[PDB]
């Protein structure tokens, strides 16, 4: 059968309980007591937290519990701690000798302070220009929460072509980082008075400008 349905995200504050839901159909979640739950931290393999709906593997915090009502299983986490921040997946035997995962839920634990991004913008190097190519590099770091939009401008004119932008990635200090690159002919670069990288984070924008000189 098809994927199980989970909320895209849930959040709570340190010390609270939160509950994550997992809706299937009558022929899987509703027919078997075989739901398992997984916690996945960035770059790690999933970790089994609950199996058979409500049992915990040995060594797994009793703050984690499982339950079910009709076709919807639930993971409840009590006394939220910062390390509980992760993606959570439910999984069920689906019948037909098949298992199926839910789409996963990102659990964010609030209270982590907001931080505007630092933006550094580099013009194309004289080395690259002397090989008849041109790249602008906009580096974006130290922002939280981890979503930014990057727009580019030539003088004051929006620029969509030749823009490549990464998704944000957690850095070791738990803030986020991203980068954006604008490819240009050297002609295009030498002909406008300036280029700008504008980064928007939470409705506020930081802008850096460079100029052929």
């Amino acid at each position: 059968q098809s994927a199980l349905t989970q909320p895209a995200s849930v959040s709570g504050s340190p010390g609270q309980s939160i509950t994550i839901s997992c809706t299937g159909t009558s022929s899987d979640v509703g027919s078997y007591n075989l739901v398992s739950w997984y916690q996945q931290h960035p770059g790690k393999a999933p970790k089994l937290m609950i199996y058979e709906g409500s049992k915990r593997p040995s060594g797994v915090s009793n703050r984690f519990s499982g339950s079910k009502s009709g076709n919807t299983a639930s993971l409840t986490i009590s006394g939220l701690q910062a390390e509980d921040e992760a993606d959570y997946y439910c999984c069920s035997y689906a019948g037909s000798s098949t298992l199926v995962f839910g789409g996963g839920t990102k659990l964010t634990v609030l209270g982590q302070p907001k931080a505007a991004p630092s933006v550094t913008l580099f013009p194309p190097s004289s080395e690259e220009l002397q090989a008849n190519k041109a790249t602008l590099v906009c580096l974006i770091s130290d922002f939280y929460p981890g979503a930014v939009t990057v727009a580019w401008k030539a003088d004051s004119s929006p620029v969509k072509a030749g823009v490549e932008t990464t998704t944000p990635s957690k850095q070791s200090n738990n803030k986020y980082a991203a980068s954006s690159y604008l490819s240009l002919t050297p002609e295009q670069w030498k002909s406008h008075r300036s280029y700008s990288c504008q980064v928007t984070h939470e409705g506020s924008t930081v802008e850096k400008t460079v100029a052929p000189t």
Partner: protein, 224 residues
């Protein structure tokens, strides 16, 4: 020392096939299903199928039918997963994980029935029409009391690239960014150092770029 150890990262062209292996250590191989689960970049977990080590029987999600071949070799406690006619959306991390064949038995045991309690470390599989290519390395020259300089590692395939500064001597203020994947199929990354602007006229900064798949190793001096 209970563990699953998977084979190393793979890079394949569309239409090829890939064979991932998974060696079990520290437990009775023949007592557990071996499940295979994959995860595309940024995406959720997706169950692929299971193999029984006792019989070699297997089942798999209907969308992998005729494309996935799971086998095992019980004498070396090793499971194998082969995905053929690869396509770019098969790019993902592939995991194996065990679950028990039985919900109980005469041996006492955990019997975490339908719970996947031990996982391999994952195998990265990259499917792309791009061809191996080393990067061009360009200096990003420095222009309140601190300055930023860096290196642009431009247009390479495949991952990974490693960057250090001054042969390892310099880590303070270094930020190496994750690569962007361009529409051309090639990657680009940047590494930036924040440095006291006073040191600029006196100390040297050299980024060391190493791209093993192309034999490219470059030490680029970055000056004012």
């Amino acid at each position: 020392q209970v563990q699953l150890v998977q084979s190393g990262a793979e890079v394949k062209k569309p239409g090829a096939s890939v064979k991932v292996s998974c060696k079990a250590s520290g437990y009775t191989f023949t007592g557990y299903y071996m499940h295979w689960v994959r995860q595309a970049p940024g995406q959720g977990l997706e169950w692929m199928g299971w193999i029984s080590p006792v019989s070699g029987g297997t089942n798999y999600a209907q969308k992998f039918q005729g494309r996935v071949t799971m086998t095992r070799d019980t004498s070396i406690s090793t499971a194998y997963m082969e995905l053929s006619r690869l396509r770019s959306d098969d790019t993902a991390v592939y995991y194996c994980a065990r679950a028990p064949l039985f919900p109980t038995g005469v041996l006492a045991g955990d019997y975490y029935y339908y719970g996947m309690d031990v996982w391999g470390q994952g195998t990265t599989v990259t499917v792309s029409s791009a061809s191996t290519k080393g990067p061009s390395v360009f200096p990003l020259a420095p222009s309140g009391g601190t300055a930023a300089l860096g290196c642009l590692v431009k247009d390479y395939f495949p991952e990974p690239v490693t960057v250090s500064w001054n042969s390892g001597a310099l880590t303070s203020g270094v930020h190496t960014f994750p690569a962007v994947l361009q529409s051309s199929g090639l990657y680009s990354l940047s590494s930036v150092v924040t440095v006291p602007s006073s040191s600029l006229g006196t100390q040297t900064y050299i980024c060391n770029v190493n791209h093993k798949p192309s034999n490219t190793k470059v030490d680029k001096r970055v000056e004012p």
